[PDB]
Write a protein that binds this DNA or RNA. Structure first.
Ligand SMILES: Nc1nc2c(ncn2[C@H]2C[C@H](O)[C@@H](COP(=O)(O)OP(=O)(O)OP(=O)(O)O)O2)c(=O)[nH]1
Ligand SMILES: [Mg+2]
Ligand SMILES: [Mg+2]
Length: 572
DNA sequence: TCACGCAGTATCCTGT
RNA sequence: GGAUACUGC
């Protein structure tokens, strides 16, 4: 009955299904003695809000202070009588909680007795600035469902979760092989000290052509390399790909050179030749559904690959577009938006790895084009197929097979680059340290990681976190140099983790320094206890130090050494 | 729906 | 005065 599964990604739709979080991952099946994809739907993640009592009753901010002391009973009565009826809230459960607070909202004391209201997510949402007669502020009005789930259940990054008393599904809700429904969030718990399971990986490369009339890109070839046991905590497997599949479609005008049959017959049986782009897209979707990859990797996947894939699927009305993702949906996500959030939603439940973003984050190169990346990482030369020659290649079997093999080689290069940098294990480590979702980590950026790190740190220590938002100061000192040439030994003395060590030493934190809503605040007293930000910083620093010790091991492999270096950099 | 800070060097342009 | 780059920590 107890469902033990490893979770990799989480998807929520704030507008369609309120209070539902779709976790995806892997579960172990003895009948097949293997790992299969699973989708668990956590339901009824009730909204939680915190009301801050006033010190003296105020006549709806009209008569100002009245002098009547306020207790939690007064706040509960005010919420039950006025607010609930006004905002159409039917049923709710309220309690009292003593919580601390130190952030950028004035008049909020350090430690106060808040009233915690828990009510379903189907009801309307209270306004942020809602002020009554006994409470002066409301916190948590717009908190998301996924954030509430992760913070309440103390879930940090991919891990093993146990579910007590799972329930089946009345109708299918996902393209996975195993499904379960949790009627409460308290039924999910995290089990520590277990190894990560293998995860399938699919590296895909597309070759297209721009039809001038429509100025729209048309797909003519796709190649994919698939590994069914890619590890998340060990070195990449050699070779980096187990199986492969290639699909090639004739253009809307040109025809094969009356020898493609013999060419494919004599080459191999893994190449699928289709006549219309609709068939190509359908076969690709079916193959993706059958393989069921947890990680899909590519170059410019967010920018060009997935966007063109979805555009062509919409244009060709290819049935079952939702196969591209892991959740069965009827309306396609709107095409557009910043970065690739629309593309991410289209592939909900499947981690997407763009080697461009990871290369930008991890290493430094003059250009992040695929050719330059292959030159700098794999140390190999990649041939380039001119855009104007792909169309003309539909005149001989040899040229068409060469084009398909070029796509295959591009896919292999992408997979090799992914393996070299340890993109996946490093992403897992960073996600576990921070506590965000893996797809967010692999989409790039730094703000989300620290945001979730501090969110977890504060929630664990009984704090009320801020509400999500809806050369400004002096920096370092650069001494004036004595420019010239020096032919004698120059000794460079550098501080170790300067700013983190400053935060630790002087105890700089939200709960220590006394801010006032552009002057430098005074240093905190030395009689206090270490805050949250210092402690977290210390943890990170120690991690880095340990990695450095590993780097110091004598007689270590070069490549591994380099990997360690990268890790160090990341942590720093 | 997004996005780490600041200090510093190098190059180039200002019509209707 | 502005604009465009990318090094350093
Ligand atoms: N916000 C921010 N600050 C940085 C970054 N890189 C360096 N700094 C700042 C904060 C560091 O404490 C300070 C000192 O630079 P260093 O390169 O010597 O790093 P640090 O001393 O922290 O560690 P290390 O000497 O490499 O062991 O410069 C950065 O990428 N972002
Ligand atoms: Mg330093
Ligand atoms: Mg000036």
């Amino acid at each position: 009955q107890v469902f033990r599964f490893y979770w990799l990604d989480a998807y929520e739709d704030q507008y369609s299904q309120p209070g539902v979080v779709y976790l995806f991952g892997k579960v172990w099946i003895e009948s097949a003695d293997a790992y299969v994809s699973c989708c668990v739907s956590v339901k009824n993640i009730e909204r939680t809000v915190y009301l801050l009592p006033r010190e003296n009753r105020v006549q709806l901010s009209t008569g100002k202070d009245t002098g009547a002391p306020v207790s939690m009973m007064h706040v509960y009565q005010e919420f039950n009588e006025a607010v609930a009826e006004k905002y159409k809230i039917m049923k709710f459960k309220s309690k009292k909680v003593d919580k601390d607070y130190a952030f950028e909202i004035p008049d909020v004391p350090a430690s106060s007795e808040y009233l915690e209201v828990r009510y379903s997510a189907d009801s309307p949402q209270l306004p942020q600035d809602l002020k009554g007669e006994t409470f002066s502020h409301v916190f948590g009005t717009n908190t998301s469902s996924l954030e509430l789930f992760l913070l309440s259940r103390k879930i940090k990054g991919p891990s093993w979760l146990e579910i007590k008393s799972p329930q089946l599904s009345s109708q299918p809700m996902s393209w996975c092989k195993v499904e379960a429904v949790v009627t409460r969030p308290d039924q999910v718990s995290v089990v520590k000290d277990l190894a990560p399971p293998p995860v399938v990986v699919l590296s895909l490369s597309m070759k297209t052509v721009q039809n001038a009339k429509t100025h729209q890109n048309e797909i003519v070839a796709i190649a994919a390399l698939v590994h069914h046991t890619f590890p998340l905590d060990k070195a990449p497997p050699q070779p980096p790909f187990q199986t492969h599949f290639c699909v090639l479609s004739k253009l809307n005008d040109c025809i094969f050179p009356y020898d493609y049959n013999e060419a494919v017959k004599q080459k191999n049986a893994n190449i699928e030749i289709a006549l219309t782009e609709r068939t190509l897209l359908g076969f690709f979707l079916a193959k993706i559904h059958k393989i069921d990859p947890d990680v899909i990797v590519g170059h410019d996947i967010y920018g060009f690959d997935l966007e063109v894939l979805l555009q062509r699927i919409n244009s060709c009305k290819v049935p079952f577009w939702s196969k591209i993702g892991r959740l069965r949906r009827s309306v396609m996500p709107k095409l557009g938006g910043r970065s690739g959030f629309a593309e991410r939603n289209a592939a909900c439940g499947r981690i997407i790895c763009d080697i461009e973003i990871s290369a930008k984050e991890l290493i430094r190169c003059k250009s992040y084009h695929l050719s330059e990346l292959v030159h700098q990482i794999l140390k190999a030369e990649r041939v380039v197929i001119p855009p104007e020659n792909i169309r003309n290649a539909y005149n001989d079997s040899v040229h068409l097979l060469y084009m398909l093999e070029n796509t295959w080689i591009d896919a292999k290069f992408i997979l090799q680059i992914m393996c070299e940098l340890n993109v996946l294990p490093l992403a897992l480590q960073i996600t576990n340290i921070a506590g965000n979702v893996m797809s967010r980590t692999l989409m790039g950026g730094r703000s989300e990681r620290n945001e979730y790190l501090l969110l977890h740190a504060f929630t664990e220590n009984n704090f009320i976190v801020p509400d999500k938002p809806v050369a400004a100061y002096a920096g370092g000192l650069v001494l004036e140099p004595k420019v010239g040439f020096y032919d004698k030994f120059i000794l460079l003395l550098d501080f170790n983790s300067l700013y983190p060590s400053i935060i630790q030493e002087y105890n700089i934190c939200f709960t220590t320094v006394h801010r006032e809503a552009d002057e430098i605040p005074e240093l905190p007293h030395s009689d206090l206890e270490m805050g949250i930000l210092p402690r977290e910083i210390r943890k990170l620093v120690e991690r880095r130090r340990h990695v450095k010790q590993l780097m110091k091991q004598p007689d270590l492999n070069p490549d591994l050494y380099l990997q360690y270096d990268i890790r160090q950099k990341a942590l720093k």
